[PDB]
Structures are given as C-alpha cells and as structure tokens.
C-alpha cells in the first residue's frame, strides 16, 4: 500500500536536505573556514 503523506514527507525532506547540503558546501567553497582542507 502506498501512503501519499509519508511518501511526500520522504521526497520533500530528501530534496530539501540535498539542496541544503549543497548550499552549505557552496558556502564553504566560496568562503573557506580556518583549517579548510
């Protein structure tokens, strides 16, 4: 049985989390923190 609410939560959170991680990585790529290696 497919649960639309659960599936939606899964998809949405996956996409927003991936986007968030790439955003953070981009921030540190643009402005390297101390010991940034």
């Amino acid at each position: 049985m497919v649960e639309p609410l659960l599936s939606g939560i899964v998809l949405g959170l996956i996409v927003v989390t991936l986007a968030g991680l790439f955003y953070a990585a981009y921030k540190q790529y643009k402005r390297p923190n101390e010991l940034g290696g």
Partner: protein, 32 residues
Amino acid sequence: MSGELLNAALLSFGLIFVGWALGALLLKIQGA
C-alpha cells in the same frame, strides 16, 4: 494519490525555509 503527496512534499520543503527565516529574524532582533 498525487495531491496529498505533492502537498506533503511542498510543505515539508518550504516550512524549512519558514523556520530558517524565523530563526534568522529572532537572531536579528536579538543583536547577535
């Protein structure tokens, strides 16, 4: 089964940005 799903996805996506905005706002009114 596309309506409730897409709705849940959209909400769980955007509410994140709403909370981020609220936290940022609280930070600004704090004076950090």
